[PDB]
Amino acid sequence: TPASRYITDMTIEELSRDWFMLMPKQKVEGPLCIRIDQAIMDKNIMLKANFSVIFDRLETLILLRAFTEEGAIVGEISPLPSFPGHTIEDVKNAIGVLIGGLEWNDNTVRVSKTLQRFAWGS
């Protein structure tokens, strides 16, 4: 995978930073794993992701995480390794579930320019 097909919204530090859930919820959407801290409310959030793009659209997700304006990780979608792989639809489902959960607790979720461009496109 080249750098003309590799989007890194997240720094190395961001990708690997440990984060804890006061009120943990976890879900599975396809071969994907979803995490929100249910303790978070009333914040602006931004979903950022690292992933590879082919034929103008997301191919493989490495990691997505939810960031408060303050710079804190309040959620995550992550790939489980399995034989099917995982599809752009899995990812797009996962994102809707993340977003749904975040807003349910009165947060406002935005998605990165690149996730708009390649996955959350319409």
UniProtKB/Swiss-Prot annotation:
Keywords: Eukaryotic host gene expression shutoff by virus, Host cytoplasm, Host gene expression shutoff by virus, Host mRNA suppression by virus, Host nucleus, Host-virus interaction, Inhibition of host innate immune response by virus, Inhibition of host interferon signaling pathway by virus, Inhibition of host PKR by virus, Inhibition of host pre-mRNA processing by virus, Inhibition of host RIG-I by virus, Inhibition of host RLR pathway by virus, Interferon antiviral system evasion, RNA-binding, Ubl conjugation, Viral immunoevasion. It is found in: Host nucleus; Host cytoplasm. The keyword RNA-binding applies. The keyword RNA-binding applies. GO terms for molecular function: double-stranded RNA binding; identical protein binding; protein serine/threonine kinase inhibitor activity; signaling receptor binding; signaling receptor inhibitor activity. A motif (Nuclear export signal) lies at residues 54-63. It comes from the Viruses. GO terms for cellular component: host cell cytoplasm; host cell nucleus. Disulfide bonds: none annotated. GO terms for biological process: symbiont-mediated suppression of host cytoplasmic pattern recognition receptor signaling pathway via inhibition of RIG-I activity; symbiont-mediated suppression of host gene expression; symbiont-mediated suppression of host innate immune response; symbiont-mediated suppression of host mRNA processing; symbiont-mediated suppression of host PKR/eIFalpha signaling; symbiont-mediated suppression of host type I interferon-mediated signaling pathway. Residues 97-122 are annotated as: CPSF4-binding. Homodimer. Interacts with host TRIM25 (via coiled coil); this interaction specifically inhibits TRIM25 multimerization and TRIM25-mediated RIGI CARD ubiquitination. Interacts with human EIF2AK2/PKR, CPSF4, IVNS1ABP and PABPN1. The dsRNA-binding region is required for suppression of RNA silencing. This is Non-structural protein 1. It comes from Influenza A virus (strain A/Udorn/307/1972 H3N2). The chain holds residues 84 to 205 of 237 of the full protein.
